[PDB]
Amino acid sequence: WELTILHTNDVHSRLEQTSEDSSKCVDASRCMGGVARLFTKVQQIRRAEPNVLLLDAGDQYQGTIWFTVYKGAEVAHFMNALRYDAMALGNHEFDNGVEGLIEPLLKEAKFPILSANIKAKGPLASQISGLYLPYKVLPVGDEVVGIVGYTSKETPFLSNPGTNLVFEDEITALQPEVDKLKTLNVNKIIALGHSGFEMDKLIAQKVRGVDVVVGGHSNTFLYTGNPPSKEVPAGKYPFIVTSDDGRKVPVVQAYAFGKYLGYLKIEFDERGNVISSHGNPILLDSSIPEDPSIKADINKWRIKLDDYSTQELGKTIVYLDGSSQSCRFRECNMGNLICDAMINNNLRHTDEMFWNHVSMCILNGGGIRSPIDERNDGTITWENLAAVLPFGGTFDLVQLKGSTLKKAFEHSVHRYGQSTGEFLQVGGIHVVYDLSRKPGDRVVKLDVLCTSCRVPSYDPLKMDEVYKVILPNFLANGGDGFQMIKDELLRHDSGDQDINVVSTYISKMKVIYPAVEGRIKFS
Amino acid sequence: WELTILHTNDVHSRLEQTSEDSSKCVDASRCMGGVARLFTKVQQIRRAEPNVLLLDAGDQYQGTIWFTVYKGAEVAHFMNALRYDAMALGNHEFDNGVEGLIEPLLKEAKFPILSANIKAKGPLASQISGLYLPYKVLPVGDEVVGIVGYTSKETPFLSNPGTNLVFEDEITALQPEVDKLKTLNVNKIIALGHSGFEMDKLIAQKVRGVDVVVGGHSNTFLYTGNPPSKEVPAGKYPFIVTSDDGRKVPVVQAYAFGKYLGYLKIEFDERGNVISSHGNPILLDSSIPEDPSIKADINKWRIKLDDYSTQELGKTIVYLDGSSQSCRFRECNMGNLICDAMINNNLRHTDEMFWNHVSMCILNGGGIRSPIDERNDGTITWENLAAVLPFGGTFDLVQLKGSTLKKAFEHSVHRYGQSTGEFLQVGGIHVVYDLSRKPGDRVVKLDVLCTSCRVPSYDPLKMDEVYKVILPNFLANGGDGFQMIKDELLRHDSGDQDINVVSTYISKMKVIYPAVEGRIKFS
């Protein structure tokens, strides 16, 4: 019996086709992904293969102005149009709190939404009961397939689920659910979830009864053969894990941003044993036409986005200096605003040991692409912010040793004076450079805002201590020569869309007035 | 013909009786003022004198939780109960914008509200037409008295009137209105307004046809004889100004906070010439009973204030360190919060030469009377803020030369180490002390946030430059040994209630997290 699993993960609001690097589409002849093109390929496969499941491993929420305006209604609408068969909750599905997930996604999806390791408490437990499930048994042809969900145990640090949801250890929560499915004579079981490739491999190894793991979160690209685009595979597709009981369990993921459709064929015997599996993600490039009906519906929904983009988000009473002459040479107030917005976006619930789990921000000055003039009655619109932050990136959370962060600050000024992009704007950091010193030895003071403290205050950076830092995905990936960040980071989780972080902060503040205040000094 | 003018000014939300220093009443046998006691005395005078006018020279708005909750409805209600005959607009009547004045005061007052020098433009001119007037001619016995109003030309820097109101020069706007009243055979004219004793004397000298000036704003106490309480008179009551045409024009004011009722008797001849005048403010002490009906109505209205005081205003995720061990010895985050709230409260409309007219704050650490613990789910209520700021003061605006501010910072640490109250918490200032230097020479660096700049940044303080600074009225009056502030300031205007400034900022921010960030350092 052959099952074809089609899968997406970390689509992150890429409803429209994008450029090759998943940013705004500008060259139509080379644009990729989008739900209209995904519809064409899914429909084509479903004409040819008898037993198909279209699955999403979470993180449809967050990434573009589509999510900013429609807040999940676009996810329910377009996933329903694609006839997704099941979805696991991702961390970003909690960005607008549990109410922003219940309404509109859980109440409007025409498919089961799953997570076996999220447990609600208090009144929320009654309010949400049955709106997401630990698993669902689906009929596929003449057989049944059980799908069990899971979500990152670190979601409380990576989104806004609130205090009435408990994120349990994935393997601990999954095993009894898979044991239960086996008692109900379900012999084909998929674990679909959102914890990252490392946890997916552990689930494949340790959760007895799981036949395949379909994951996400880590934006992992897996491929068997010559890659079709610029993504470099972390391993073959599927990635085979040998389980504790000796089975070969395929693990799949399909990068992010709707650029690929994962495609895995699994051959099962009559008792649900996996005989073999093969496949590969399919690059959704211009060779696959956008479905005209889905595209026309996208164009209709885009009208409200165009309208929203010109509305006042809030006001500034100061000139927002995002010039290169300032932001690539010294502390600039646009850089301070963006880092303050990044820290505000990452305020999450804590135990009694931290005021917040993260207090620090770095931002390459070359990533700030325009100032904003305050003389248009102080108005700031999304279109103005998109000129400042045009790359479609995210502001991610990383864990870096103090030694790595000191090397990043040395890199920031290693060839100072040429208007290069690596000069860092900061938040929760006070750095002093002495440019008369040799490159690599120019940082003379580096103080950081504490997190494990009830009163935030600055203390010297410690080389062996690991710090959480919010920074662009461009820098987490080693852009601008920050190879030390890519190579030495101890954890990396994708964050919110860059424009959206700043827009939300400006709308919350109503009137902004960021100052240049001595976060960066020169001796 | 004898006219008795009863007058109040700068009542500032003191609806309830207060202590002798106009703070919370705690010893009933020695409490003063309040509208119930004012009613008793006004009613007594109106039984005995035939020609009485009860006037208010503005600034009923702002000062206690009454204004925070009722937003002017309490002013219309209790001024109507007292049967005020006329009121001039004060600067604080614009604290909640022009909408917060129209609704509820202008639409609910049963007396004319006056200002001849405020001119509206755009649609507002039609919306507000006739809701305030330049003047009103009132019948008094068998005669008529014209009352012409005026409001501080500096109101745009001292409240929130918005950009559709123009504040003209008082004398320029008053003269044509008084000329018009004279053409209508009105021969007895009172100028009632809110610009301060200095401007009141100029109006008495220069506006031809004005028989008496009833003022406010500067909280001036005038008295003829031995003063009845702790207020020291600035001059006799009335203060006589010789007009340009040789008339003797009485100028009156009655301190502030409803502690006194001004009482002036003017003898006019049949042609409206002033023959003589005499009087004195009456101390509203415990010897005058509170009117039981007004007091019972006050007690009824107080219920909603008690309810409001326990509601969550917003949350803190940090411990708000208002301890004396911190705030009298070093930068404390409660001090930073209060100074940031003071600067936010003073954001006003500007031309293109300033991002804001004021950027600096000083606050005596001894004025911070409690920390706030963040472990009650981060909740902050008005009752918690009242424990931090219990004195019932205001956060005022002063103009100080840099030399005066340097002397204030030397005073801040002149006897450092004894937990004395004068140690300053700051905003928009970065100071460095070297305590090994002799007292009076301990300030080694003092940088200030610019105002005449499009991007706020810090520069060294200049001894000859005048800076606007927000600070407690306690310090503006020379408290804590800051005699240099009292003696050398170039302008002083009373600001908003201390608790209200902080409450509004916390409610706007929703979640606060003030840090100790290096505003005060030690070498």
Ligand SMILES: COC(=O)c1ccc(CO/N=c2\ccn([C@@H]3O[C@H](COP(=O)(O)CP(=O)(O)O)[C@@H](O)[C@H]3O)c(=O)n2C)cc1
């Ligand atoms: C609609 O979207 C685009 O046009 C789009 C274009 C690219 C990507 C991918 O590359 N992402 C980048 C690329 C560069 N930079 C910054 O730009 C600096 C270079 O800028 P300049 O010295 O001014 C040279 P230029 O005028 O040709 O741009 C780098 O040093 C670096 O600091 C980034 O921050 N990011 C995130 C994504 C989208």
Ligand SMILES: COC(=O)c1ccc(CO/N=c2\ccn([C@@H]3O[C@H](COP(=O)(O)CP(=O)(O)O)[C@@H](O)[C@H]3O)c(=O)n2C)cc1
């Ligand atoms: C319900 O209201 C009152 O209890 C009320 C009491 C008074 C006033 C008038 O006085 N106003 C003040 C008085 C003092 N202080 C500060 O307190 C310091 C002295 O405090 P300690 O060293 O702690 C001595 P203590 O325990 O007896 O208070 C001063 O150095 C000064 O920094 C002020 O800030 N203000 C504004 C008003 C109201």
Ligand SMILES: [Ca+2]
């Ligand atoms: Ca099986």
Ligand SMILES: [Ca+2]
């Ligand atoms: Ca006259």
Ligand SMILES: [Zn+2]
């Ligand atoms: Zn993701």
Ligand SMILES: [Zn+2]
């Ligand atoms: Zn994720």
Ligand SMILES: [Zn+2]
């Ligand atoms: Zn006043």
Ligand SMILES: [Zn+2]
């Ligand atoms: Zn005033």
